[PDB]
Ligand binder design. Structure first.
Ligand SMILES: *[C@@H]1O[C@H](CO)[C@@H](O)[C@H](O)[C@H]1NC(C)=O
Lengths: 37, 49, 50, 50, 49
């Protein structure tokens, strides 16, 4: 009904895969929500 | 053939994959085929191995 | 022409095939076949919080 | 469902049986995530370039 | 020295245009007459590293 626009902050990130990883910095290439939208 | 196996091949005669040679064949409708029916020859299908 | 399309290397499913199963051995150098995963090693319980 | 790829030579798996990315002999010990099957019909001629 | 050894061990996860980066999966899925082509791609790639 009533519309507005606001900053999305840094939300919209999930666990892309069910493979367990610990203390690593993995670099993914999946579909996401771009930061600060 | 050196590659692939068929029902007769895996149960009667299998060709090695590392095969060096030629295979020549032709129709035998009159040589190995009897005009009244050819049944003396046999083929195996129950080797189980 | 029936096409039996399929994928591989994902979460395991029930459709595996006609093979048997054995019991478990631990702390011994033994090959393993944990649903496709083929290799050798020593299996030990730990505290990896899956 | 636990499958059984021993359905070879029961009714008519002849003419064409070539696989892609897998060998026909190795189906019996491969576990798949999913199995997808379709059974369309074509003219059974040179259009077999699928 | 740490960078050289870290990069050397991370080259094992590449494919070099093959089906998979693990020898066991290639051997357990494809027949020897064909799987020898896939293994040849990993050997050349890993020898270069
Ligand atoms: C989002 O859209 C609104 C209206 O279309 C615009 O004013 C704004 O600049 C855009 N970007 C952000 C980050 O809000």
């Amino acid at each position: 009904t009533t519309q507005s626009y606001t900053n999305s902050f840094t939300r919209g990130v999930y666990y892309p895969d069910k493979v367990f990883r610990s203390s690593v910095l993995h670099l993914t290439q999946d579909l996401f929500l771009p930061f600060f939208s | 053939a050196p590659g692939q196996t068929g029902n007769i091949a895996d149960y009667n005669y299998k060709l090695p994959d590392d095969f060096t040679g030629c295979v020549i064949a032709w129709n035998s409708n009159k040589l190995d085929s009897k005009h009244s029916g050819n049944y003396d020859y046999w083929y195996r299908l129950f080797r189980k191995s | 022409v029936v096409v039996l399309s399929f994928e591989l290397l994902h979460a395991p499913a029930t459709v595996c095939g006609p093979k048997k199963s054995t019991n478990l051995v631990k702390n011994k150098c033994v090959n393993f076949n944990f649903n496709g995963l083929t290799g050798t090693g020593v299996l030990t319980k730990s505290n990896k919080k899956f | 469902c636990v499958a059984d790829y021993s359905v070879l030579y029961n009714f008519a798996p002849f003419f064409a049986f070539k696989c892609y990315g897998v060998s026909p002999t190795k189906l019996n010990d491969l576990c798949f995530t999913n199995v997808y099957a379709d059974s369309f019909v074509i003219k059974g001629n040179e259009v077999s370039q699928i | 020295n740490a960078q050289a050894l870290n990069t050397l061990v991370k080259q094992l996860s590449s494919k070099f245009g093959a089906i998979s980066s693990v020898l066991n999966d290639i051997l357990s899925r494809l027949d020897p007459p064909e799987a020898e082509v896939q293994i040849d791609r990993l050997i050349t790639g890993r020898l270069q590293s």
